[PDB]
Amino acid sequence: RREERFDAYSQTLGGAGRFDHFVEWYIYLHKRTVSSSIKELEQQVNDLQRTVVSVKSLLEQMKFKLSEAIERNDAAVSSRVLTESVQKSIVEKAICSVVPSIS
Amino acid sequence: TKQYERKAKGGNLLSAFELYQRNSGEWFEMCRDYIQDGHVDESGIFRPDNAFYLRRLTLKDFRRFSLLEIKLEEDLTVIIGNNGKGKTSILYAIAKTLSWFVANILKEGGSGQRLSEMTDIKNDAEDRYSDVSSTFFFGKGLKSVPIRLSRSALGTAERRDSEVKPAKDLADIWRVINEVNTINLPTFALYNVERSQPFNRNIKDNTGRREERFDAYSQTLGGAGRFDHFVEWYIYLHKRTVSDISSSIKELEQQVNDLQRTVDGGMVSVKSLLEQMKFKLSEAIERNDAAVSSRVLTESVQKSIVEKAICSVVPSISNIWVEMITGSDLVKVTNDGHDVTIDQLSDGQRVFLSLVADLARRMVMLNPLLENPLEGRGIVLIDEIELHLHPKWQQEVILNLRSAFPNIQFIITTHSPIVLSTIEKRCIREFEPNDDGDQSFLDSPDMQTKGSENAQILEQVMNVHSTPPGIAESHWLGNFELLLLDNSGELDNHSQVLYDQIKAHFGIDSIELKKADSLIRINKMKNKLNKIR
Ligand SMILES: Nc1ncnc2c1ncn2[C@@H]1O[C@H](COP(=O)(O)OP(=O)(O)O)[C@@H](O)[C@H]1O
Structure with missing residues (x-):
């Protein structure tokens, strides 16, 4: 399942703050944020599909981006959320600001 | 109402049952007779008047299938095709549907198994949901029992809900009538390729669960059977045959009487022991009464039926029995003329023994009122029937199964032309070799397979040259x-x-x-x- 806004309330009042959960989450966010209109993206995906061997990796990345964009578009106001890249950056800054001797 | 009364008198089972439920004798008896009535054919085989089988299956956006429709035979349907054509997917779809009957026979409002969001939805499905639609038949009184399992993909535009109420309603009839008076129940089982697994020697001793009638529904649709449960149950049967329960009751009755006389004679110290023994006696009588109340086959007869079935269906096995060796009970077999343990059997022999033994156990448990419990009703799914079998066994396997279990609907998958040489073309459903997932109908081959040469079946049905x-x-x-x-x-x-x-x-x-x-x-x-x- 994808992450959803009200997961923030899951186990908030017991079970929170476990190191393994962080590491797993952080690596996940990194992999997703390693490498923007839907119609434009749809057009780019279509153009890349027509070209498709060396561009196959790029096509798969763009298809993922398109699916995500559609999902965000389809997703409700009540679940509306910041990009994974932004989320990652905020958490990184929080850690470095707060934790003694981690820069 | 008057309408329900008319339909019920016309032989409609649901109407009869509804009238029974609202008034809660005649309606009960009608329902019971619908389930229990049958006749013995000219071959001496019992045949239910109202048969139960899967008639039709439809798959929409399920795994590889955009749309697929299959008509099934009452007795035997064989699905054939190349690797990756979806033969296993078809059996899995049926198994999930059958899970809803099993759950509701066991418990009111029991839930069966759902379609997976991750694996069961076709990858490029426009509508992003999957449907498995099945229609069952139960005599002329209930010609159509439609069931639909549905699942929507994870993104979720809208919920597509499953429609399982008819399965639940029918299962309720079986459950409720059985509660009042013991009836024979349908067997549902799936044997997938997971049945091929190593035997553990370490037989857990009878805690008590394996002797319960509805243990027959335990993990029936999990794919492997429970051959370990068979061994436990069979040893249990043996121990009970060597020791009668009523003699224990008579002995316990005598011990209670002797202890009561001692207490009456002034020895108050043995009163605690008397109370314990009275409890044990009451429990023994209750078990005896429950056994009596279940109207069940004797343990000796049960043992014999299963042994005969195994020996008849499994060619290498001529005898099976329980030995007390050292201080632990061991099942022994005469295999190829030599006495061996189960752990000494070949994988092919063990896997096939496991299938038949498990099935026989469940049938004996679910059909206590039949003279031959193996003549009960049910639907059995078998994936890759030829698994681990030499060609000589492949020439016998379907014949043996159908002879031992004459009223079971078998839905099987095979890659073996030798198996197909023993089956009529009407029972065969073949995928087109060039099927890219957009095939509405599975069809019978053009050639008659039963009694045909294997080389011909290779070329004409399996699309393989007879020479490499x-x-x-x-x-x-x-x-x-x-x-x-x-x-x-x-x-x-x-x-x-x-x-x-x-x-x-x-x-x-x-x-x-x-x-x-x-x-x-x-x-x-x-x-x-x-x-x-
Ligand atoms: N969700 C799915 N979407 C598309 N194709 C799928 C899906 N799941 C399985 N497949 C394809 O279906 C086949 C697996 O079907 P299976 O029932 O195991 O075949 P068989 O029993 O004939 O060997 C493979 O060709 C696989 O690529």
């Missing part, structure tokens, strides 16, 4: 013939060399050499005629 095309020697006879025809039928240097190669490779007595010889003879004679002309 990627071996050069497979083409030598063809090449030889061409050379003979190029040189006006006379053996030239080139044709002689190839002839010698054929002789050297296949041998002097080979069919191939005889064909070559035949070609020489015919062509020489044809040429002589041509010269005369």
Whole structure:
């Protein structure tokens, strides 16, 4: 399942703050944020599909981006959320600001 | 109401049951008779008047299938096709549907199994949901029992809900009537490729769960059976046959009477022991009464039925029995004329033994009122029936199963032309070899398979050359013939060399050499005629 806004309330009042959960989450966010209109993206995906061997990796990345964009578009106001890249950056800054001797 | 009364008197089972539920004798008896009535055929086989089987299956956006519709036979349906055609997917779909009957026979409002969001939805489904629609038949009173399992993909535009109420309603009839008076129940089982698994020697002792009737529904649709449960149950049966329960009751009754006399004689110290023994006696009587109340086959008879079934269906096994060796009970078998333990059996023998033993156990438990419990109703799914079997066994396996379990609907998958040679073409449903997932109908082959040569079935049904095309020697006879025809039928240097190669490779007595010889003879004679002309 994808992450959803009200997961923030899951186990908030017991079970929170476990190191393994962080590491797993952080690596996940990194992999997703390693490498923007839907119609434009749809057009780019279509153009890349027509070209498709060396561009196959790029096509798969763009298809993922398109699916995500559609999902965000389809997703409700009540679940509306910041990009994974932004989320990652905020958490990184929080850690470095707060934790003694981690820069 | 008057309408329900009319329909019920017309033989509608649901209407009769509804009238029974609202008034809660005549309606009960009608429902019970609908389930229990049957007749013995000319071959001495009991046949229910109202048969239960899966009639039709439809798959929409399920795994590889955009849309698929299948009509099934009452007795035997065999699905064939290349690897990755979805044969297993079909069986899984049926199994999930059957899970809803099982759950509701066991418990009111029990839930069966759902379709997976991750694996069961076709990858490029536009509507992003999957449907498994099944229609069951239960006699003329209930000609159509439609069930639909549905699942929407993870992104979720809208919920698509499953429609399972008819399964629940029918299962409720079986459950409620059984509660009042014991009836025979349908067997549902899936045997997938997971049945091939190593045997654990360590038999857990009878905690008590394996003797309960509805243990027959335990993990029936999990794919492997429970051969461990069979062994436990069979040893249990053996121990009970060596020791009668009523003699224990009579002995316990005598002990209670002796202890009561001692307490009456002034020995108050043994009162605690008397109370314990009275409890034990009451429990023994209750078990006896429950056994009596269940109207069940005797443990000796149950044992015999299962043993006969195993020995009849499994060719290498002539006898099976329980030995007390050292201080632990061991099941032994006469396999290929030698006495061995189960752990000594070959994988092919063990896997097949496991299937039959498990099925027989469940049938005995679910059909206590039948003279032959193996003549009960049910639906059994078997994936890759030929698994681990030599060709000689493949020629017997379907015949043996159908003989032992005459009223079960078998839905099976196979890759074996030898198996297909024993089956009528009407029972066969074949995928087109070039199927890219957009095939509405599975169809019967054009050739009659039953009694046909295996080589023909390979070529005409399985689409495989009888001779391996990627071996050069497979083409030598063809090449030889061409050379003979190029040189006006006379053996030239080139044709002689190839002839010698054929002789050297296949041998002097080979069919191939005889064909070559035949070609020489015919062509020489044809040429002589041509010269005369
Ligand atoms: N969700 C799916 N979407 C598309 N194709 C799928 C999906 N799941 C399985 N497949 C394809 O279906 C086949 C697996 O079907 P299976 O029932 O195991 O075949 P068989 O029993 O004939 O060997 C493979 O070709 C696989 O690529």
